[PDB]
Amino acid sequence: MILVTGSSGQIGTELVPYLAEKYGKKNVIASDIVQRDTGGIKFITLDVSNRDEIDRAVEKYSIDAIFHLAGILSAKGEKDPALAYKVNMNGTYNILEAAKQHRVEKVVIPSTIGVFGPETPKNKVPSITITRPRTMFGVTKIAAELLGQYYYEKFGLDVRSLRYPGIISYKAEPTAGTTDYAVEIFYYAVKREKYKCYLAPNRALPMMYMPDALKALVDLYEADRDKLVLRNGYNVTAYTFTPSELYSKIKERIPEFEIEYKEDFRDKIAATWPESLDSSEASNEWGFSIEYDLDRTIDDMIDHISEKL
Amino acid sequence: MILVTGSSGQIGTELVPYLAEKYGKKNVIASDIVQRDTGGIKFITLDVSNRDEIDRAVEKYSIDAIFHLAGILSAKGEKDPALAYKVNMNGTYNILEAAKQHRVEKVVIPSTIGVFGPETPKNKVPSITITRPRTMFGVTKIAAELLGQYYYEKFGLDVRSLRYPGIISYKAEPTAGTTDYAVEIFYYAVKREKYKCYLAPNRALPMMYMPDALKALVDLYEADRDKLVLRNGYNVTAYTFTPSELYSKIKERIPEFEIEYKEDFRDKIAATWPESLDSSEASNEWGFSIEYDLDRTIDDMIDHISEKLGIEGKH
């Protein structure tokens, strides 16, 4: 049995059915503190900050594996660092301790480029590098990777993690995140509405499309334990672009599209992150690969977003 | 008014009177979960994992600065990672948040070479480097540095830290760490007994003598704001040695002692850490310096330990 925490978020929304298709509907349980449609898949309310809740769920459902998605992200984190610490720090600690006590074969955690800071090289960054995050989210996330690796080295709990870039998707609505301009922009485009972008025109960031994001997570999950070396902190990426680049490419498709730049705190967050990642380790150790290049993602998004409008 | 957290430990035991001497006994409050003689300086019971206790102390004594020493060290930490997490991680958060909410001007935190891991370069490591610790202790400590820096950048709270190497001292006996052998060996030397060392004969580690350690922390506390660029994570060191080197140098003074090597878990810990540090940043930004080189530390420790053990009577 697989438990997914924070199932209602950007990734959860799609991962749950992905897991059900791969491993069977009876074998997944979705969980969050906020409920959404899981298409029949079993759902339970679970606050990761309550260790007890976790202990109870893991027992009652005979949980074998956990995809621990619950968290506060970079923007919200700057708005409410105490909340981020509680959910991310406390929450992740609770998950690890609970998993370690019980028979938890595997815990998979989505980490982030948010673990990087200004001292981290901006281009082709390898996984082993400077990690001096400047956001409460980032601090919590590097802590997560370190804890995870510790639990593995110390207790033999199989914790695995990769570092996602910005994820572009259509199934779940964006949530005003630092990288979410890359999703919002498509909504505006299909309506031929001028977009007001909160990141600088030339703010380059690594990104990837959700189909590849889901595949990566699952490939990491599936990898053979004795075959991972790095194990936690795998950089993964598909492409790097700036808001003006993404806009220009969209406009090639939807020429009436316009944009204006009104940068805010989220730009400042982004500025602390690298521009592009080296994802060799993930490819070598577990065969991470990308099926959707930028063009494909752009057209797929326009296709899906107009049509769901 | 200065509060010291974890004052009963190796560092606290000496920092408390060091602080009182410099700023006055009335302006220093010692605190710990375990009391020990403070030589007339005010002591209060305080468990840092209990936020309400911190709040009460800070309120009552109008605390202006906190030297936050409370914590579980590398070895003890591996025996009880859950204790280390609770004390180190949530204790530090509690301190930071309390200071912020109250009007504590400065917080100083002693970090550690424990923040480093196998991937960290072994020689003359600088402050900005790979930080992938493999002890719970080390995880908490890097978290502490990051949180401390966050508290400055986010809220404007003046949080500072340096990274200590192993510290050698004679006033208090360290118990819960990996670098302790460098204190232990002197007791055996002075008694002319065989020392059983728990680290490999070749296990190089950076180290420094307490006097220099105390000065460093206080110098960082007093440093001009305008030069504090790195702010958190300053590497500091005096010298690097292996147990076989230290033994050999002590033997130069006291020929009639010996050593055997029976490595334990602690050696595995030490193996993950770098051998030597580059402390340039500390010297550049706040004037870090060392007064006790290796020889002077060895001779001073022999002196004081001999007196402590009645090899040479107090006069």
Ligand SMILES: NC(=O)c1ccc[n+]([C@@H]2O[C@H](COP(=O)([O-])OP(=O)(O)OC[C@H]3O[C@@H](n4cnc5c(N)ncnc54)[C@H](O)[C@@H]3O)[C@@H](O)[C@H]2O)c1
């Ligand atoms: N989306 C991305 O581009 C991205 C990139 C890197 C890392 N990540 C990581 O992936 C995970 C989820 O990402 P997402 O985009 O789906 O986030 P999201 O904001 O869409 O979803 C997060 C979920 O966490 C839930 N939550 C908050 N507090 C909780 C608590 N105490 N107990 C249980 N649930 C709680 C929210 O209600 C929400 O449904 C996080 O760990 C995040 O840091 C995401």
Ligand SMILES: NC(=O)c1ccc[n+]([C@@H]2O[C@H](COP(=O)([O-])OP(=O)(O)OC[C@H]3O[C@@H](n4cnc5c(N)ncnc54)[C@H](O)[C@@H]3O)[C@@H](O)[C@H]2O)c1
């Ligand atoms: N001694 C060193 O070589 C060295 C090196 C690097 C960093 N440091 C740091 O210096 C600080 C103290 O070092 P030390 O060598 O004196 O340690 P120590 O083990 O000698 O003393 C630690 C003190 O922490 C106290 N303590 C434990 N839990 C507590 C709690 N919940 N509330 C209040 N007090 C609590 C203990 O009772 C003890 O008196 C730590 O933060 C440590 O990580 C020390």
Ligand SMILES: C[C@@H](O)[C@H](N)C(=O)O
């Ligand atoms: C990708 C990750 O950093 C997240 N989407 C954020 O905006 O914080």
Ligand SMILES: C[C@@H](O)[C@H](N)C(=O)O
């Ligand atoms: C190195 C420092 O953290 C402490 N002396 C230890 O042994 O843990």
